[PDB]
Amino acid sequence: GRFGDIQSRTVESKDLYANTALKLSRPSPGVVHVPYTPTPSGFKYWLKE
Amino acid sequence: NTQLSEAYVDRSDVCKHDHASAYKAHTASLKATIRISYGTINQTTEAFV
Amino acid sequence: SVTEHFNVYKATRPYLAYCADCGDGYFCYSPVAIEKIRDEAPDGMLKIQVSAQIGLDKAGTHAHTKIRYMAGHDVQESKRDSLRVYTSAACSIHGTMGHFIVAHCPPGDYLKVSFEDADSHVKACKVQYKHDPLPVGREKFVVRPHFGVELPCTSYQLTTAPTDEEIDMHTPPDIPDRTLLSQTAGNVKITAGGRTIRYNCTCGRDNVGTTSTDKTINTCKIDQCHAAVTSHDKWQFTSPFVPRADQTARRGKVHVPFPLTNVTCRVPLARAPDVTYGKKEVTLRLHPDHPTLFSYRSLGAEPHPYEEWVDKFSERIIPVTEEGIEYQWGNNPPVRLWAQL
Amino acid sequence: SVTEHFNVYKATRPYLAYCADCGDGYFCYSPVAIEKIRDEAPDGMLKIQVSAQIGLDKAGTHAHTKIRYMAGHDVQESKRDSLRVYTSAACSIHGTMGHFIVAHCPPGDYLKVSFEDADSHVKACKVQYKHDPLPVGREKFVVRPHFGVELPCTSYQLTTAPTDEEIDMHTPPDIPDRTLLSQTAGNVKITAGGRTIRYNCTCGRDNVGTTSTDKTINTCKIDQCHAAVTSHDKWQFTSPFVPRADQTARRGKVHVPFPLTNVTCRVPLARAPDVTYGKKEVTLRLHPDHPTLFSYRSLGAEPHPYEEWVDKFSERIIPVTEEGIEYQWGNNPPVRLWAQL
Amino acid sequence: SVTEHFNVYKATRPYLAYCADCGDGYFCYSPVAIEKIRDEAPDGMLKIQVSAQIGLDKAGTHAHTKIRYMAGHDVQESKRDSLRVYTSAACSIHGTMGHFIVAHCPPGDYLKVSFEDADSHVKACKVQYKHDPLPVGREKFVVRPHFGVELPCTSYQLTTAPTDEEIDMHTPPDIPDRTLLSQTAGNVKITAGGRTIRYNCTCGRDNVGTTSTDKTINTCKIDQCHAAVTSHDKWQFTSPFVPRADQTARRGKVHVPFPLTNVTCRVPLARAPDVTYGKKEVTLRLHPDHPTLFSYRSLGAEPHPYEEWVDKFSERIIPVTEEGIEYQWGNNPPVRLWAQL
């Protein structure tokens, strides 16, 4: 979730690193929930900084 | 062409009651209502101090 | 018994009083106002009490379009949008029962009860509507839509009770009335109606007559003319700043709809940061969330307890001993600092 | 003077002009303006004067349902409720006189006026004049519905205030609006339409000059022989965001509604904690209330005063001298703590 | 590229998403879905990724009062003005296009979106929708109708662009509408309309039938006749709580709106206070405004960098010397801090 957690190799290029904590959960009781939880957005965090 | 603008700042008329005074200091008064109990003369007496 | 809470509005026809604000700026007759409160909020169901039958129709129609308010100038029958949540906003109103109205809403201090179901624009019984957060959980998030908690809170539950409590109603009041009647030259040549109006003349036998059918009483006019407009089926005990010498010193009861009970809720389990358990010290760093107590606890030892209901993403060294600590930072289990390996 | 409502309203009927915030990120020629705020009645009597006649039917008089806005594309004489003074809030509906709406309304910096009755579907024009009063008395509340105080203050005038205010117009109407153009090549085929339309051209006495009928105008065509509807039939306000291309420096004067006078108000009466007065000590257990000015003043001594506009159940440390403490807080009366055994 | 509305609206018969906060806390397939938010603003004309063809009706292009409310309670045109926003406040949607809605709101943390004319009794699907102000410029106001700049910043597009990207959903229908079955005891009967009821018999190896009509299942009925929501004709992209794990990878690719351009916003440039550049010192006594951003740089020198948010006028320490200081306070040019002689 640091400044540059969205890793990007080349700006025209496709691949990259990435360290946002993409931690989904095995879902809830009746609603078969997307339990998805990423890290807080490093674009938005870098905008905060 | 121009925008030959004027501008007319006046005393805004809500200071037709909305004023503020600055008393340059003069003498303080003494209006005394001394309760005078001269024995059986039990009454009030008020005047300039 | 509570099968006839419509009978519970019939035998006690309620009525708003002299209300201290129908607008922001008038102490007057507030006939549709917020008479009191009943806030047993484990989960944010405040029930504000109003002197109309909000939770029933005037004849007894149970529906939002049979929305009862009461007055001798009559029971106002509104559609339910003329119930007015103005609690510093339009709060999420669950509904009305009896004299109270239950709902949720955001926090604030300025509560407004609007009553405008077809008989006016809106009569706005303002009050100091101090509704706090009173949040529950490790966090400061409040939402349904994630899978994050079963918090066993209280709830002013959805039951219309046939007996839970006692809303006490008795002592039918009297209305001050020389204006509902008409004054003669040396008398009152007036009719009674809008209240059971006992008369009081400056001289004459109009000084004892209750009002359903008036007359002309000469020789004791206004200027020594007075009348009090009482009511039949008067079971309303709660005129706050209404006159209570409507002489029946006794109340019947009433059941208590919207009662408290146990209900879970969804929780903001507040996320935990990157924790490098480094070679001399652990170190966690947490992002902002809903404002949650980052909470270290001294595991086993003389316990350093320390939390902070924070929302700005910062770090904390886990001073991690061999004994170590317990970092439960907003609603996770306690972070077991046993530092070794 | 200004003491007649009707013609002094309806002489120069209102002109919807260029407001710099009408849409999402741009302004337009907004139908309802917001000119200047008259706020000196201390109960928050914000009398916003803008480009609509505040409370005037379009044919002139006090039409209760009619709010009169006008454009050269014609008078939108529409409903009363389609204006909302969204002052960080809903409409703080008090009243409206002349060319102004006077509102007792809740706090918020980004105020708006919205127009919906016959001048548009809606139009929203905002002003940053943040309506947080800080009223009279020491206390931290605005308490109308309890009679905690009748604080002396400004009653912003809501009577028939004909002549304290003067709505003016000097350099009469100057703004760009040339919508009466028609199609021609060299002798321009214009019709009747648009506004009080003159031409500003390189030929013609109607091609450069007054078109008041159908015309083929010579020496100035479309493309560089323009036209313009100038503001006539009134001295409209000053038009701000407007020009002095209407160079007729003249006089149009009319009333403005309701200047303020003296008046009492509802206030938060003084809430006191329990003062631990002891044989050499004074403390006060002040409970939490609205954030109120507690003024523990030196009672006759050196008056190094404890001030606070405080909302905490704290200790008011009463060091009681032989002189006594002057302890009065929150619009309650004082206390003369003479400290003796 | 999506520059025509026709086929991208003609495909999308949409479905209601699992919403655990629509009302009090009630949760179900709400017919207007709130998929995501989008930051396309310099200021925040936010574009939420919404549940239907947002305005995209059955009329191919949008009818502006035909908001394509798309549930099994059908894909029809509710009163399109009934769509509004709650940002914690009534938002200002400049437009709505595709599966998105783009416009401003009170920039904050409490998401809500509302269909009104049959888009709910009140249809408010919400979130804790954190979308902060983040204003361009040191002054913390939004200068609507005249500001001290007209400065270009990366806003989004308010004309919803046809397509540069592709909202390409997958997994056609698998969701909560399964009540189209019905009970016999030993032979269940079938009659359905309003979903794609894929059947399943319990005493029977032919009971798996996609329903559009009547049917029968002898030997096992509902209660072992499992008939559930199957469909096709889109990818209503990522409905959580429900099948976005439909096992058929079959997708729909539509456009997205709002190409970002540098919109020139009314900046914060206000008049600065009296420069008390002392004969051996510097200071700047500044006034207050909207919450400002002043700057000190060690101008020429060692860089003492300073700055500030602003809410009250203050005298700032101007580094007074011939060697200069570096000032720049709220949307204006700097001050080269030089003392003269």
Swiss-Prot record, chain A:
UniProt subcellular location: Virion membrane; Host cell membrane
Recorded superkingdom: Viruses
Membrane topology: Single-pass type I membrane protein
The record's account of how the chain is modified after translation: N-glycosylated.
Role this protein plays: Class II viral fusion protein. Fusion activity is inactive as long as E1 is bound to E2 in mature virion. After virus attachment to target cell via host MXRA8 and endocytosis, acidification of the endosome induce dissociation of E1/E2 heterodimer and concomitant trimerization of the E1 subunits. This E1 trimer is fusion active, and promotes release of viral nucleocapsid in cytoplasm after endosome and viral membrane fusion. Efficient fusion requires the presence of cholesterol and sphingolipid in the target membrane.
Quaternary context: Interacts with spike glycoprotein E2. The precursor of protein E3/E2 and E1 form a heterodimer shortly after synthesis. Processing of the precursor of protein E3/E2 into E2 and E3 results in a heterodimer of the spike glycoproteins E2 and E1. Spike at virion surface are constituted of a trimer of E2-E1 heterodimers. After target cell attachment and endocytosis, E1 change conformation to form homotrimers. Interacts with 6K protein. E1/E2 heterodimer interacts with host LDLR.
Designated name of the protein: Spike glycoprotein E1
Residues of the full protein shown: 1014 to 1062 of 1254
